[PDB]
Structure formats: C-alpha cells, structure tokens
C-alpha cells in the first residue's frame, strides 16, 4: 500500500479519465475515425485502471 | 489546422506521454501483468496519436 503503488494506480485513473475527455472533445469535433480509435483507447485505458485497482488499491 | 482540432491532438500527445510515465513508475514497481498492459496502451495512445497528426495537421 506503499506511496509509488498508489502514485501508479492515480495515474492509472488520470489517463482514463483523459481518454473519456479527448473521445467527447473528438466526438464534438466530429472527429469520426479518431472518436473510433479514442473510444477504444479508453476501454483499453479502463482495463489498465482495473488490473492496477485491483493489485494497488486498498 | 483549426484551434479545437490542435487542443485535440495536443492532449492526444499527452496521453501517449503519459502512458510511458506509468510504463515506467509500473516497471520500478515490477508490476508485470500491468506493464504489459501499459506497453499496449501505449501503442494504442500511439495509433490515436498519430491519427490525429494527420487529420490535424
């Protein structure tokens, strides 16, 4: 439960909630290709955030 | 070339960057099964990147 292992897991968090932005900034550009990649991306970034909750988190 | 679509692709660059940050905070860590993740997301943050580079111009 150690200070590197929850700096890792926030920026975890960080880069999905990035990601959630960029894909509506992208979707309110309609930006349709990059909105497709970035959805994805987010998914992607999602299930990083879970595996690190799961080994990090309290 | 327009204001928004560069806002975009500069936070598209961020997040690429980002991911190399806990690409290696996750290998300090010998956190395996997530850096493995990270690597991938990575290459996935570059895909979107590069993307928008050439939409955006």
């Given at each position: 439960?150690?200070?590197?292992?929850?700096?890792?897991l926030?920026?975890?968090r960080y880069i999905?909630?990035?990601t959630l932005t960029?894909?509506?900034k992208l979707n309110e550009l309609d930006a349709?290709?990059?909105a497709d990649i970035?959805?994805?991306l987010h998914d992607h970034a999602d299930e990083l955030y879970r595996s690190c909750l799961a080994r990090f988190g309290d």
């Open positions: 439960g150690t200070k590197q292992e929850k700096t890792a926030n920026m975890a999905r909630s990035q960029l894909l509506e349709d290709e990059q970035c959805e994805s």
